[PDB]
Symmetry: C4
Subunit: 30 residues, 4 copies
């Protein structure tokens, strides 16, 4: 009777996937 | 009872729209 | 008592002030 | 005890840990 807080959770794990991409900066050329 | 936990949710979405900006580096810095 | 959930919120506001720095990518690379 | 809400918190502390890495850009630039 309150999936509002849980629903938002999906957003937390989601950003993680993208976080991996940004890593590209820390490797090539440095 | 107060929307204390909910209010934080608004902060979660903000990350998504901004994340799109940082992507400019990954895709092409022009 | 259950300030466990609230505590997490405090950390959320923190990421915001720092996000400002990330802007550098844009402010530099058109 | 329905640690569903707590699990989400773990994601918050994670950001901070990685967040310092990204800092490498300003604190140094080869």
């Amino acid at each position: 009777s309150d999936p509002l807080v849980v629903a938002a959770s999906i957003i937390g794990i989601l950003h993680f996937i993208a976080w991996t991409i940004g890593h590209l900066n820390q490797i090539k050329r440095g």
